[PDB]
Scaffold this active site. Structure first.
Site, PDB file in Angstrom:
ATOM      1  N   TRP A 165       0.837  -1.192   0.000  1.00 39.66           N
ATOM      2  CA  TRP A 165       0.000   0.000   0.000  1.00 39.66           C
ATOM      3  C   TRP A 165       0.886   1.261   0.000  1.00 39.66           C
ATOM      4  O   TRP A 165       2.046   1.211   0.437  1.00 39.66           O
ATOM      5  CB  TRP A 165      -0.955  -0.014   1.204  1.00 39.66           C
ATOM      6  CG  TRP A 165      -0.272   0.132   2.540  1.00 39.66           C
ATOM      7  CD1 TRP A 165       0.131  -0.875   3.365  1.00 39.66           C
ATOM      8  CD2 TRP A 165       0.084   1.361   3.207  1.00 39.66           C
ATOM      9  NE1 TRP A 165       0.718  -0.357   4.497  1.00 39.66           N
ATOM     10  CE2 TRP A 165       0.705   1.011   4.428  1.00 39.66           C
ATOM     11  CE3 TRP A 165      -0.053   2.726   2.892  1.00 39.66           C
ATOM     12  CZ2 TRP A 165       1.185   1.968   5.331  1.00 39.66           C
ATOM     13  CZ3 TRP A 165       0.419   3.677   3.788  1.00 39.66           C
ATOM     14  CH2 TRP A 165       1.028   3.295   4.994  1.00 39.66           C
ATOM     15  N   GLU A 184       6.866   8.697  14.287  1.00 40.58           N
ATOM     16  CA  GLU A 184       7.048   8.109  12.964  1.00 40.58           C
ATOM     17  C   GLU A 184       7.993   8.944  12.102  1.00 40.58           C
ATOM     18  O   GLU A 184       8.807   8.397  11.371  1.00 40.58           O
ATOM     19  CB  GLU A 184       5.701   7.946  12.244  1.00 40.58           C
ATOM     20  CG  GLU A 184       4.747   6.939  12.871  1.00 40.58           C
ATOM     21  CD  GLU A 184       5.159   5.482  12.661  1.00 40.58           C
ATOM     22  OE1 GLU A 184       6.175   5.214  11.973  1.00 40.58           O
ATOM     23  OE2 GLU A 184       4.463   4.589  13.195  1.00 40.58           O
ATOM     24  N   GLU A 244       8.538   1.993   6.841  1.00 38.18           N
ATOM     25  CA  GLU A 244       8.262   2.969   7.896  1.00 38.18           C
ATOM     26  C   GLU A 244       8.060   4.387   7.368  1.00 38.18           C
ATOM     27  O   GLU A 244       7.342   5.182   7.968  1.00 38.18           O
ATOM     28  CB  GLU A 244       9.394   2.987   8.923  1.00 38.18           C
ATOM     29  CG  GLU A 244       9.470   1.762   9.817  1.00 38.18           C
ATOM     30  CD  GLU A 244       8.328   1.682  10.808  1.00 38.18           C
ATOM     31  OE1 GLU A 244       7.668   2.713  11.058  1.00 38.18           O
ATOM     32  OE2 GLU A 244       8.096   0.583  11.349  1.00 38.18           O
ATOM     33  N   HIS A 291       4.440   5.603   6.819  1.00 40.17           N
ATOM     34  CA  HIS A 291       3.665   5.904   8.039  1.00 40.17           C
ATOM     35  C   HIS A 291       3.616   7.394   8.365  1.00 40.17           C
ATOM     36  O   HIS A 291       2.541   7.961   8.557  1.00 40.17           O
ATOM     37  CB  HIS A 291       4.229   5.137   9.245  1.00 40.17           C
ATOM     38  CG  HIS A 291       4.243   3.649   9.071  1.00 40.17           C
ATOM     39  ND1 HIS A 291       4.747   2.795  10.029  1.00 40.17           N
ATOM     40  CD2 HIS A 291       3.817   2.861   8.052  1.00 40.17           C
ATOM     41  CE1 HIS A 291       4.629   1.547   9.606  1.00 40.17           C
ATOM     42  NE2 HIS A 291       4.070   1.561   8.409  1.00 40.17           N
ATOM     43  N   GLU A 338       8.373  -2.222  18.452  1.00 39.90           N
ATOM     44  CA  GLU A 338       7.441  -2.654  17.408  1.00 39.90           C
ATOM     45  C   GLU A 338       6.100  -3.056  18.004  1.00 39.90           C
ATOM     46  O   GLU A 338       5.053  -2.684  17.484  1.00 39.90           O
ATOM     47  CB  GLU A 338       8.004  -3.824  16.592  1.00 39.90           C
ATOM     48  CG  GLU A 338       9.217  -3.511  15.720  1.00 39.90           C
ATOM     49  CD  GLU A 338       8.974  -2.420  14.688  1.00 39.90           C
ATOM     50  OE1 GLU A 338       7.804  -2.183  14.308  1.00 39.90           O
ATOM     51  OE2 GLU A 338       9.963  -1.799  14.243  1.00 39.90           O
ATOM     52  N   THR A 392       4.147   0.199  19.276  1.00 41.16           N
ATOM     53  CA  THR A 392       3.495   1.010  18.238  1.00 41.16           C
ATOM     54  C   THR A 392       2.320   0.264  17.615  1.00 41.16           C
ATOM     55  O   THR A 392       1.301   0.878  17.291  1.00 41.16           O
ATOM     56  CB  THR A 392       4.481   1.483  17.132  1.00 41.16           C
ATOM     57  OG1 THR A 392       5.059   0.350  16.484  1.00 41.16           O
ATOM     58  CG2 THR A 392       5.686   2.200  17.733  1.00 41.16           C
ATOM     59  N   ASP A 447       1.596  -3.271   9.590  1.00 46.48           N
ATOM     60  CA  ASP A 447       3.018  -3.225   9.251  1.00 46.48           C
ATOM     61  C   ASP A 447       3.902  -3.515  10.469  1.00 46.48           C
ATOM     62  O   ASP A 447       4.864  -4.289  10.373  1.00 46.48           O
ATOM     63  CB  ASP A 447       3.404  -1.867   8.658  1.00 46.48           C
ATOM     64  CG  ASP A 447       2.966  -1.701   7.220  1.00 46.48           C
ATOM     65  OD1 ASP A 447       2.073  -2.442   6.755  1.00 46.48           O
ATOM     66  OD2 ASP A 447       3.463  -0.829   6.475  1.00 46.48           O
ATOM     67  N   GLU A 448       3.576  -2.896  11.608  1.00 44.97           N
ATOM     68  CA  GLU A 448       4.387  -3.039  12.825  1.00 44.97           C
ATOM     69  C   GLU A 448       4.407  -4.478  13.322  1.00 44.97           C
ATOM     70  O   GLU A 448       5.419  -4.934  13.849  1.00 44.97           O
ATOM     71  CB  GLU A 448       3.928  -2.085  13.945  1.00 44.97           C
ATOM     72  CG  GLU A 448       3.481  -0.691  13.489  1.00 44.97           C
ATOM     73  CD  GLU A 448       4.615   0.178  12.959  1.00 44.97           C
ATOM     74  OE1 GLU A 448       5.724  -0.335  12.692  1.00 44.97           O
ATOM     75  OE2 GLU A 448       4.396   1.397  12.807  1.00 44.97           O
ATOM     76  N   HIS A 458       6.964  -6.324  11.400  1.00 41.73           N
ATOM     77  CA  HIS A 458       8.269  -5.947  11.945  1.00 41.73           C
ATOM     78  C   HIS A 458       8.557  -6.648  13.276  1.00 41.73           C
ATOM     79  O   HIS A 458       9.668  -7.137  13.491  1.00 41.73           O
ATOM     80  CB  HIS A 458       8.384  -4.434  12.112  1.00 41.73           C
ATOM     81  CG  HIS A 458       8.138  -3.666  10.854  1.00 41.73           C
ATOM     82  ND1 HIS A 458       7.738  -2.347  10.856  1.00 41.73           N
ATOM     83  CD2 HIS A 458       8.226  -4.033   9.553  1.00 41.73           C
ATOM     84  CE1 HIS A 458       7.591  -1.934   9.611  1.00 41.73           C
ATOM     85  NE2 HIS A 458       7.880  -2.938   8.801  1.00 41.73           N
TER      86      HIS A 458
HETATM   87 FE   LIG Z   1       7.591  -0.752  12.671  1.00 43.78          FE
HETATM   88 FE   LIG Z   2       5.829   2.788  12.090  1.00 38.86          FE
END
Ligand SMILES: [Fe+3]
Ligand SMILES: [Fe+3]
Ligand SMILES: [Fe+3]
Ligand SMILES: [Fe+3]
Lengths: 338, 338
Positions: A45, A88, A126, A129, A179, A182, A211-212, A215
């Site tokens: 995305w 971010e 990242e 974000h 990670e 967040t 996404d986090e 990670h």
């Molecule tokens: Fe992250």
């Molecule tokens: Fe992030």
């Protein structure tokens, strides 16, 4: 006009140099277990997916409807959304952090090691974000972009000492924690935005949250294999970070006006149930459970002391009208409960 | 869907370890000569200064007038403005670059060395360049933000090897060149925007240009004192970079469609007089003149060969209907002359 500073003396290279070889020899492993859990760019995305389309005849009404929705979101929520965004946006600092680690750093900026390839592809993810939250907050008209931009410049200038002391052990444990934190923070802003009457903003926060999680998976996986090969060294690294206490990336926050900006923003996040003290220990207890610290056999005396310290800490932390209103420059000095 | 890659094998730590001490001992010097040439945050411009104000009743007409002006700026100009912006947006890579340098890197992320303080405050200044161009291009409606965002994610993922081999000598020379180059690029987009009928966009580019000049000053000053203390080592570093040829930060550019994206964007910048081959040598000749390479006494045989190579190169390079139209994804596959 001085930003807050780190209160401790800075320590470098806690890890022995004849011990970099482990990560050097783990390069293939990280390809098959960390770099296969990466989404190709084409399938990712982009911030434009969730924002008004400036090349569409619909642009004006899309912007107008975003701003109409934003009026119905209260100030204290925007304060937290803004703090999350500033964090971010300090991204460059965090890639620097990952590249201070002895055996796993990118030594050129385009290194073909599995560690360097990961660091670059994680950064690239990242970066979206900040871009997305930045333009959302800009269009909203509810916040003071100049003071936010000023806070960000202070933040990158001040940077941050996560106290990882160039060790992949301490550093990868530190990323695993952050990670998760967040993922929760963003996850909770997404949950609330549903009922606040606004599905589009809920999509934004949740897409970031997803996404986090990816990670988190990868970083805890690296420490999983670190405990497998080096139970003694890794349990000692774990405790070390907890003894020092996990300092958050945006803790030196400063807008040129409030001397306790992070503490004040944290309290609003705390009161709203976005990220709490309870959350902090829930991460600790999940990570103690995830790496199965209780079941670690054949440790040193120094290793068994460390083992007991990390295992007993999660219940210990959990055992810990009132708050005033305070102005925030991020919202033109309007006030919210702390 | 593979981005272009660096074609050479990567080399680390070209500089001797018993030679880091020079920069360690130069810490006070950099305070008095590099860190006194830094603008305090409070006195710095912010992207909001040059963009429509979303907390003003004037927001709608400001956005509308920006978009009206943007229609009268031709496609090929937007192509170059977009390439310039993508480069600015890869910032995290460039701070990583500066932190790969042996005696001048930030080892924690908040190091109180003069080198680390500079790196952080420079990054913080560079961050505003991307933010401002990003939101300008977004509001304009003339460009494909999704494909730009995609190009950026590819770029940070790919990163970049500037071939500085962890040496402050090679790295500080490499930054000196790049700062001058962007100052020119941005300076020229600002000059043109005047007559193109648009003063506000001219302000944006020129304000960015003024920042790069300050960065240039400081980096060339560091190499000035490097030649003073180590004429032999620095002249050899200079030549080394020129022998290899200065590779631009955004040269691995990729949008998922064009396999020669940088070359194609460079040619448009070349044709429009934004940044040319002539510019490249003009920087070389300015830097040979600025560091006074012709007047360097008592060099080695290896040092005298290097001296002659750098001194003779600027005239050599200068001695070097036609072009077709090509589509660019950054502008929805509309075409411009190359
Ligand atoms: Fe992250
Ligand atoms: Fe992030
Ligand atoms: Fe710049
Ligand atoms: Fe610059």
């Amino acid at each position: 006009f001085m930003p807050p500073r780190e209160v401790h003396v800075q320590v470098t290279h806690s890890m022995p140099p004849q011990k970099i070889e482990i990560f050097k020899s783990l390069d293939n492993w990280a390809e098959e277990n960390i770099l296969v859990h990466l989404k190709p760019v084409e399938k990712c995305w982009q911030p434009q997916d969730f924002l008004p389309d400036p090349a569409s005849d619909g642009f004006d009404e899309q912007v107008r409807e975003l701003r109409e929705r934003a009026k119905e979101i209260p100030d204290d929520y925007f304060v937290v959304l803004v703090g999350d965004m500033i964090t971010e946006e300090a991204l460059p600092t965090y890639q620097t952090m990952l590249n201070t680690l002895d055996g796993v750093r990118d030594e050129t900026g385009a290194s073909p090691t599995s560690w360097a390839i990961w660091t670059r592809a994680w950064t690239a993810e990242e970066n979206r974000h900040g871009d997305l939250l930045n333009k959302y907050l800009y269009l909203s008209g509810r916040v003071d972009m100049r003071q936010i931009e000023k806070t960000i410049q202070y933040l990158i200038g001040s940077g941050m000492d996560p106290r990882t002391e160039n060790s992949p052990y301490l550093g990868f444990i530190y990323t695993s924690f952050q990670e998760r934190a967040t993922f929760i923070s963003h996850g909770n802003t997404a949950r609330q935005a549903k009922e606040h009457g606004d599905i589009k903003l809920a999509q934004i926060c949740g897409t970031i949250a997803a996404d986090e999680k990816r990670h988190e998976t990868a970083y805890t996986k690296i420490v999983e294999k670190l405990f497998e090969i080096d139970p003694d060294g890794t349990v000692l690294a774990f405790a070390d970070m907890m003894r020092k206490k996990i300092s958050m990336p945006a803790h030196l926050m400063y807008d040129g006006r409030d001397d306790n900006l992070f503490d004040h923003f944290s309290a609003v996040a705390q009161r709203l149930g976005v990220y709490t003290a309870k959350d902090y220990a829930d991460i600790l207890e999940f990570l103690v459970g995830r790496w199965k610290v209780d079941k670690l056999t054949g440790l040193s005396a120094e290793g068994q002391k460390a083992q007991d310290y990390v295992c007993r800490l999660p219940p210990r932390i959990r055992r810990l009208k009132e708050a005033p209103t305070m102005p925030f420059s991020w919202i033109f000095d309007r006030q919210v409960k702390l």
